[PDB]
Ligand binder design. Sequence first.
Ligand SMILES: *[C@@H]1O[C@H](CO[C@@H]2O[C@@H](C)[C@@H](O)[C@@H](O)[C@@H]2O)[C@@H](O[C@@H]2O[C@H](CO)[C@@H](O[C@@H]3O[C@H](CO[C@H]4O[C@H](CO)[C@@H](O)[C@H](O)[C@@H]4O[C@@H]4O[C@H](CO)[C@@H](O[C@@H]5O[C@H](CO)[C@H](O)[C@H](O)[C@H]5O)[C@H](O)[C@H]4NC(C)=O)[C@@H](O)[C@H](O[C@H]4O[C@H](CO)[C@@H](O)[C@H](O)[C@@H]4O)[C@@H]3O)[C@H](O)[C@H]2NC(C)=O)[C@H](O)[C@H]1NC(C)=O
Ligand SMILES: *[C@@H]1O[C@H](CO[C@@H]2O[C@@H](C)[C@@H](O)[C@@H](O)[C@@H]2O)[C@@H](O[C@@H]2O[C@H](CO)[C@@H](O[C@@H]3O[C@H](CO[C@H]4O[C@H](CO)[C@@H](O)[C@H](O)[C@@H]4O[C@@H]4O[C@H](CO)[C@@H](O[C@@H]5O[C@H](CO)[C@H](O)[C@H](O)[C@H]5O)[C@H](O)[C@H]4NC(C)=O)[C@@H](O)[C@H](O[C@H]4O[C@H](CO)[C@@H](O)[C@H](O)[C@@H]4O)[C@@H]3O)[C@H](O)[C@H]2NC(C)=O)[C@H](O)[C@H]1NC(C)=O
Lengths: 207, 208, 13
Amino acid sequence: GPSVFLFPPKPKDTLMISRTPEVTCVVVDVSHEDPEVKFNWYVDGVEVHNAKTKPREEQYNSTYRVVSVLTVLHQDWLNGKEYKCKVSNKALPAPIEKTISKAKGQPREPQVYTLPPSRKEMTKNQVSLTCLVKGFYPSDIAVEWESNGQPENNYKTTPPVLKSDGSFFLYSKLTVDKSRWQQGNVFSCSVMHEALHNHYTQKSLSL
Amino acid sequence: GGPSVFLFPPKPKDTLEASRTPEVTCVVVDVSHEDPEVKFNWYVDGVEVHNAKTKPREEQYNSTYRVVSVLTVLHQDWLNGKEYKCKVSNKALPAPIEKTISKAKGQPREPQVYTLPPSREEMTKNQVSLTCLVKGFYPSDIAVEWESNGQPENNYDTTPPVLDSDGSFFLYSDLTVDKSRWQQGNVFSCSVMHEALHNAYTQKSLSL
Amino acid sequence: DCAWHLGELVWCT
Ligand SMILES: *[C@@H]1O[C@H](CO[C@@H]2O[C@@H](C)[C@@H](O)[C@@H](O)[C@@H]2O)[C@@H](O[C@@H]2O[C@H](CO)[C@@H](O[C@@H]3O[C@H](CO[C@H]4O[C@H](CO)[C@@H](O)[C@H](O)[C@@H]4O[C@@H]4O[C@H](CO)[C@@H](O[C@@H]5O[C@H](CO)[C@H](O)[C@H](O)[C@H]5O)[C@H](O)[C@H]4NC(C)=O)[C@@H](O)[C@H](O[C@H]4O[C@H](CO)[C@@H](O)[C@H](O)[C@@H]4O)[C@@H]3O)[C@H](O)[C@H]2NC(C)=O)[C@H](O)[C@H]1NC(C)=O
Ligand SMILES: *[C@@H]1O[C@H](CO[C@@H]2O[C@@H](C)[C@@H](O)[C@@H](O)[C@@H]2O)[C@@H](O[C@@H]2O[C@H](CO)[C@@H](O[C@@H]3O[C@H](CO[C@H]4O[C@H](CO)[C@@H](O)[C@H](O)[C@@H]4O[C@@H]4O[C@H](CO)[C@@H](O[C@@H]5O[C@H](CO)[C@H](O)[C@H](O)[C@H]5O)[C@H](O)[C@H]4NC(C)=O)[C@@H](O)[C@H](O[C@H]4O[C@H](CO)[C@@H](O)[C@H](O)[C@@H]4O)[C@@H]3O)[C@H](O)[C@H]2NC(C)=O)[C@H](O)[C@H]1NC(C)=O
């Protein structure tokens, strides 16, 4: 019958106190005949009652997709409390239970370095500004670029790569006009990660 | 249902290094026990070829067999864009399954290769990172290595390619070395293999 | 000790 998938909140939502993180319990292959689903939610084995069901959606293979959403607290999440979804349905001999938590293990702090473009790059119209973020754990991170308090348009971040010491690294590349670089403009690399002080840090780069 | 086919390319490094063996790889899965026989036909630009190596049935212990056929390609042929077709026949399919793969199509672009020293800030630690930025290349097939004094440097990690906003690709490679070695002035080299470079090869040095 | 990100509040100790 139905299958259950449990999904974590977005990294930023857990890190920014001004945002609302949520775990999502997704039930697929719910039938046209027994469409009723009952969710039970537990936080470290203690039942909570604040979840809300999203509107039910019919798929093309004519099953329903049924979804319960639970608001979690930043620090509970960050402290690694366990969230359990219990799904009941008549097509189901017994209820299905899935459990989610933050990635297990001792967090490690992102070492963050800015790197100026190569001299050999000064030939081209555009130069590359490089932010190296390394030795972090877990891999939940956000990395953005800014100048004079404004987000920069043209940058790309590599996905996190697992190093052989068990931590992650990535690089973010900012592409700007040679002028802006050359005329002293200050650019900033911003990182969010649970293990940074205030989940934040900012490193700057200019000529 | 019936069998499913997956057709895998050779490794970029394999297609770029003459001493290496590039292979196209046709994998048939979900072969039943009651109908285990599988026929492979291989084509290169629509012309059938006869020298693929097909391996015996492999028991998967999940009610199915897995069967693999491996085609060795000529480097120059993969590099010049020849198409490779795997056609798979089995009694549980209504019709045979054909899959085709080739090198990505698009105007090849030369990789810009820039080396970047460790940050001043990194000098408080045992080990520093040496960076190789490789950008603007197309297609995404590429290989990156590191060396110092004619000897290979193994302690590195390279990001997969990332699609850049101008439709070209970039990646970075981090060679991580004992700080002492950097401070000595020791010369390190970033090596890049890619089709659009002269000699499919380039070497940019990095030192103090 | 508050960190802010583009005018948006991240975290205070
Ligand atoms: C009938 O049809 C349905 C689906 O309908 C079809 O969908 C596709 C296939 C179309 O082409 C059409 O045919 C149809 O419309 C079938 O339902 C599917 O069943 C699969 C199981 O058979 C199931 O596979 C499992 O998926 C997991 C990942 O799912 C992700 O990612 C995919 C995209 O990659 C996405 O489609 C899913 O919806 C889901 O997306 C995530 O949702 C979460 C929760 O909402 C999001 O995060 C939250 O959301 C908001 C943001 O908006 C907020 O931030 C919240 O705080 C946050 O929590 C998240 O953003 C989404 N991610 C992405 C990437 O978009 C896999 O992990 C899982 O793998 C695991 O389990 C496997 C076992 O099956 C193992 O093999 C494996 O190793 C792992 O253990 C599965 O692969 C599909 O998800 C499911 N599809 C959908 C749409 O629900 C159904 O099967 C079919 N029935 C039949 C009989 O054919
Ligand atoms: C019964 O079991 C089999 C066997 O599976 C194993 O054992 C079982 C018991 C389980 O434990 C499995 O986890 C085990 O793997 C099951 O067979 C599987 O069926 C899947 C389909 O249901 C199929 O999924 C497709 O995978 C594609 C990628 O496959 C990669 O990557 C996975 C890891 O992600 C890896 O497991 C595969 O082996 C394969 O790895 C690549 O293999 C090639 C070939 O060797 C390598 O290329 C060669 O490498 C050599 C060196 O070795 C040399 O360099 C050659 O030059 C070179 O060609 C390559 O290096 C390997 N890559 C990596 C990273 O290792 C996906 O692309 C594909 O995606 C598609 O899926 C959907 C549509 O189908 C779409 O959503 C999507 O768009 C894509 O189109 C599929 O997910 C599994 O690959 C397949 N596994 C194997 C081992 O064959 C079988 O299903 C199961 N049946 C039942 C009923 O239970």
